[PDB]
Amino acid sequence: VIFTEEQEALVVQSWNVMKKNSAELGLKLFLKIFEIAPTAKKMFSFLEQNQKLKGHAMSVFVMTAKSAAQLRKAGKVTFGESSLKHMGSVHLKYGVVDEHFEVTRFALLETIKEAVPEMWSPEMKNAWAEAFNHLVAAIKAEMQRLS
Amino acid sequence: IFTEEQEALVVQSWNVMKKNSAELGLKLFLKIFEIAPTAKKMFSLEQNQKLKGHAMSVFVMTAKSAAQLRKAGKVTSLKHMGSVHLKYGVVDEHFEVTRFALLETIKEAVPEMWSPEMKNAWAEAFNHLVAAIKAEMQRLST
Ligand code: HEM
Ligand code: HEM
Incomplete structure (x- = not known):
């Protein structure tokens, strides 16, 4: 797929600003997740400032920014060895559906x-959205590859 | 149990929203399909649609619940609500x-x-209504 250099800079530069507050931005991310769909808590087996709840939210942030660099360099999201299968296996094992x-x-x-x-800008969200969508598509591709 | 103060918060606020109920229905489903676009697959062009009339039902049946929960203590068609939502696979996330x-x-x-009691008033009125719908949804084989 095509991913412009401006869309890459929008994600990289904005993430460079958010790197220091990533911990607090992680808790707030899951606060909105658990506010919109409180049943999402059941998938996580882990009091209110829970470290793996932030560490997971950390991953969603950092892997999305890393995805934007791959979409510009090669045009796809590439995972490493014993990593793509781990992403698909975990989300499949806990029943992560499209709504999640x-x-x-x-x-x-x-x-x-x-x-x-x-x-933020009407161009900033599409940069983070496409980087997040291609990342989810790769996770879902390995979840749907258990034939 | 649903206190009289919680009833007044919903009844009075809905009386103001009665005139804008039509547009408030489209706005409800616009945010629903923005947060979770896969919810469209459960339904069947979509400028003005029966989805607004469906969202109207979500509005009007919730306001009816607040009056019923205060008057009698229960939400008072029910068999149809459970049957339809069950057939289309409406889950808790939805x-x-x-x-x-x-x-x-x-x-x-x-x-x-708005108030910390105003949101809780509509929230509990919506929860008791959904709990009644979900009680009739558990009318499957298990
Ligand atoms: C782009 C989106 C996402 C990314 C990059 C991502 C990434 C990750 C990572 C790195 C792990 C850790 C795996 C491990 O440590 O073994 C993980 C686990 C997990 N994720 Fe995701 N995730 C995403 C979306 C989601 C969503 C939407 C949900 C559901 C709300 C979810 C639920 C879980 C659960 C339940 C675990 C396992 C936690 C545990 O082992 O206790 N993830 N994910
Ligand atoms: C919360 C997520 C919900 C979803 C995803 C959902 C979805 C649906 C769907 C797909 C139908 C079938 C429409 C058709 O086939 O014509 C339906 C029917 C209906 N829904 Fe919901 N529903 C939800 C909640 C509610 C709530 C809270 C109410 C109000 C109490 C409500 C009121 C109705 C009514 C009255 C019908 C009857 C439609 C008919 O008889 O043709 N829904 N719903």
């Missing part, structure tokens, strides 16, 4: 809009 | 996304009045 990915995307954009209020 | 979008339409849309 799409609520997380909505909450992610809401956490990127309230973090940097003066960087 | 009910709570609709609740979030509903509350965003009751506090952030055109009704500009």
